[PDB]
Amino acid sequence: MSSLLNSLLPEYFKPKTNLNINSSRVQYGFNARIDMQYEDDSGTRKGSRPNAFMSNTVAFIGNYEGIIVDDIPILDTAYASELLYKRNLTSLFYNMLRLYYIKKWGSIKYEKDAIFYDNGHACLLNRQLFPKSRDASLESSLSLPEAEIAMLDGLEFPEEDVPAITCILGQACSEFAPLAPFSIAHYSPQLTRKLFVTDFEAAYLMLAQTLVSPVPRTAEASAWFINAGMVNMPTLSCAYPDMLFYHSVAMIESCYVELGNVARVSDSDAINKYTFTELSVQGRPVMNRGIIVDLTLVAMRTGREISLPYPVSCGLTRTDALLQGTEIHVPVVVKDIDMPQYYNAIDKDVIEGQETVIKVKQLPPAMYPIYTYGINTTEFYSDHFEDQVQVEMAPIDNGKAVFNDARKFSKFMSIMRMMGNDVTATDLVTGRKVSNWADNSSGRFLYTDVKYEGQTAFLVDMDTVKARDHCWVSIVDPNGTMNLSYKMTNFRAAMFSRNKPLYMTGAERLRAMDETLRLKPFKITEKLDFRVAAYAIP
Amino acid sequence: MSSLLNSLLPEYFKPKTNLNINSSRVQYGFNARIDMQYEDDSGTRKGSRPNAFMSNTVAFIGNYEGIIVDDIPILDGLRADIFDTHGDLDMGLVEDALSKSTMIRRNVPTYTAYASELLYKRNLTSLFYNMLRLYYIKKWGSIKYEKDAIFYDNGHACLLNRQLFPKSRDASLESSLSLPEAEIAMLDPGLEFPEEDVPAILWHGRVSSRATCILGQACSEFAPLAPFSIAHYSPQLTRKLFVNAPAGIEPSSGRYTHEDVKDAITILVSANQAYTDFEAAYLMLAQTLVSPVPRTAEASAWFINAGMVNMPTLSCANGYYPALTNVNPYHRLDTWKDTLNHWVAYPDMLFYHSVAMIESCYVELGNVARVSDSDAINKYTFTELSVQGRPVMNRGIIVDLTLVAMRTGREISLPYPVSCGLTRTDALLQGTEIHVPVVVKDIDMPQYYNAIDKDVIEGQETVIKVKQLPPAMYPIYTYGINTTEFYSDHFEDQVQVEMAPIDNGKAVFNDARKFSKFMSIMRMMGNDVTATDLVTGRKVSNWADNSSGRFLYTDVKYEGQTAFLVDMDTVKARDHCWVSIVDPNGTMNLSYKMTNFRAAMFSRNKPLYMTGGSVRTIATGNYRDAAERLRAMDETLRLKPFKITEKLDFRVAAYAIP
């Protein structure tokens, strides 16, 4: 559905036809201009950040598995009556589209002993997260066999379990058995053995989910991509190409941003992680799985009613790591000796080179809003164009300021980050050090960087406030009530690949509203807690 | 359907009966008067071509291959009593009808049991199709096909008949086929149980000595030597054919003329009551009679791989049940005999109906190939939304009739949703590169064409890579009835190229639309312009055709960014009856006007004239008013007298009327 996914892109950005991708990693963002204005009891200070780059990172690596399931027929004598109620060519077009992009971008290298995430304290290699893998190019990954394409001559009885519609059709129907973990070369079962000689729209949306996978914002956000997500491919029965990259990035961003909020919803409300899809959908699908889950999250993001002609339930299901009451064991590598102080590690004493495991209870946000920046602003992300943040500074006793409240602590470290001051605080309950400079790519502070669900009080170190990036606005000693008023203008999209700039080249409405799928949006209603999110009907 | 194919012909076109075709190539078109004008700051330069010939070359060659498929039964012909209110064979009235007939009493119970299967075997389209091809093979039998002949030539690239059609020996159309005869046995009325998988037909009186030879050859394999359009490959329809004729079948004569095939058809349709079957066969042949010679060298991608013809299996069970066919048949539409009556009167009119259909299709497939897949009505799903019936499979005539509906902009209605004939949209739906062979003439070829080699000596066999399919025909019969801005087939048109004196003749066209109109109108004025793309570095020439004399944007042979540098001091006068651009300064304004239209046809570089009587628009009413009249003049020989009258001379006699 082109017109749907085309709407998600920002109004200022209009991309060109061709895009020569020559790597397994692409940064995308914008170069904005920030005009900050500071006021406190000491006096006033005015500055301006001339060029600020806010970006996510997306890759072509994601462990997926295919299952053949029975879905609804797309309707767009004895034998005909049995066959017409199972007609679906979506699985055939899906494989034909994957073969197109394997040949086009068939020079992408996957190295086994490469980095996946790297902050400075911890590190994840591609040996971990993807065992049973070797070093191979994308063209060298698959060695597809060929199914028998026979000619249908007068034959009176249709042979059962064979559809009726050379090298491309032969390989499209065959089994996919990859060596390197690639997004568009994932394991798929055999469609058919023989093949005698709106369905495309389903396959187009189904590939937009799979094509690219997010590189995690922090080390804790690797918990999403441990367990292999299942791709529901329908059973095969019948009786501007490069623009897909931008539509795919737009879709997976919208899903992984909104799951950041759904994860924080308490399991004692009307709309919760279990019963959010069922309340949203207003059709009759086979099961609330695949695309229905993803398009529900896009509706919640944009805040508009999305509509498909047929209630199709085919594609990747992401909400698997979310729907289980168990802490997830992310395997990590120790780079600095002081790692156990920051991350919730099993072994409290470690050495540089040791392979340990960290515990993740609540799933943090995997991506920050970039394309969907300021279309609807929540208090959690605080992705405003114009905003006036007001916070009251705690009394500095010796060289330490106690922040008992949770909301005030979030606003304080959010200001000091925009000014460009690397502040480090100690959580009193756990006894672990939090830092506002957690993510370098996106220049903002989320409350999930604390890495402790529940209630606590923070002891901020005001003496050891380092000066990483200093504009004229930037001050070290706050006094009384801190007011910061910033304005964002002059947005321009920029893409980076392999640490260099990647440039773009080239009569009556018979309603019939009974069978059609409709997805209703939910609006976030902020409340006093700030740690908990809550949904309501608009 | 004679009616819908008749409306496609232009208003000025007044056709006659006979057309004496004596070659395998015809240039149909029209003569128009073009009043061109070139306005500039210096002054205006007027021109006028009184006879401007816009043509589309059409040949009698084209690779096709027949396959026998299963299609719906056509129920028009059977008596109206056995049918129910809804319109399906109510079995129970069939048993009643067979009982009250002249049938053998011991056969009634065994024949009634078989009725459930055999009565739904009614499709004679395959037989009529082959018998129509035998008519035209014997009529236009003297046309020749040479092996080492020029299929296409534009000066730069040449394409021979050896390249497209291998396994091809040079021979005349008459000497191409050597048809073996199938057995025509006589049906014994006292047969115990009907033999299914063997069709039995009806006949009026005695099967003549020549009718045996025609039916024998019609139900046989076509194995041609030369690749002719009306003598393409067809499988064996049947091995044996029963004929329920009480008067015995005479043995095969061996020889027959084209007039004897018309005699065979008229008896077969009348006896079997199969007029809707003939209408299907008429539309099938209309598609696959003539194929278009490609407009450009790179427009040969349509005719590389052989398009499959869908011939429905020969199945008829009228011979076993003579009682069920009578003088009161069941028919859906009242105008169900119009297609046969038109063919019997004017056989040669099919040539004009054929070119009208292929010109309508290949024009629309031109501007269908230039739409992105990400759209509602696109390459794959343009047939499904248009069709409002229940055909078995969207192929054959359904795909060709829906393209005609888009061209004319009207609603086409058929009585039965039959899916038989040629399927054209084959190379389009594949959506891959096609490798057309070419023999080079000049040495500077691969700058213009997207060739595989960059340096090629003259007389070398190379390959051109065609990605997007260019239009194979230009609209001529459908000129300015449903106009689009791509073809730009207007009566009046103008273009404004804006230049300043500071620029020394050099103009850059940022817009793609007005670049197309400038290059096209300059060719009417007889000027050889050669533009060069600034981004890529390729070259395009407006002189890329010798038939229509227009420039379509698909002649660039590349989709990219638009920056065409045209140097206006290298413009060369090529043709006669031309306006001169000696040295332009300031803003240029080109314009033309087409005023009158006269139908013209060419063959062997000579005028081909239409002869015979004046063709009329035959209606159902025009014959049945003479049936209403009946010639009701009582057939009584009333002789009236003449009174002799005497005058001055008296030697000579003079008779008066009263």
Coordinates of C-alpha atoms in Angstrom, one line a residue, chain A residues 396 398-403 421-427 434 458-466 476:
Chain A
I396 CA 23.9 21.3 46.8
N398 CA 28.6 19.1 50.1
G399 CA 29.0 18.6 46.3
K400 CA 25.8 16.4 45.8
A401 CA 22.2 17.3 45.0
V402 CA 19.4 14.7 46.0
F403 CA 16.6 14.4 43.4
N421 CA 27.2 18.9 30.2
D422 CA 28.1 15.1 30.8
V423 CA 26.5 14.7 34.3
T424 CA 26.8 11.3 36.2
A425 CA 24.3 10.4 39.1
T426 CA 24.2 7.4 41.6
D427 CA 20.9 5.5 42.0
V434 CA 23.4 6.5 35.5
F458 CA 19.2 9.9 42.7
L459 CA 22.4 11.5 44.2
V460 CA 23.8 13.8 41.3
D461 CA 27.6 14.5 41.3
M462 CA 27.7 18.4 40.7
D463 CA 31.5 18.7 41.2
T464 CA 32.4 16.2 38.3
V465 CA 30.3 17.9 35.6
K466 CA 32.5 17.5 32.4
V476 CA 28.1 24.6 34.9

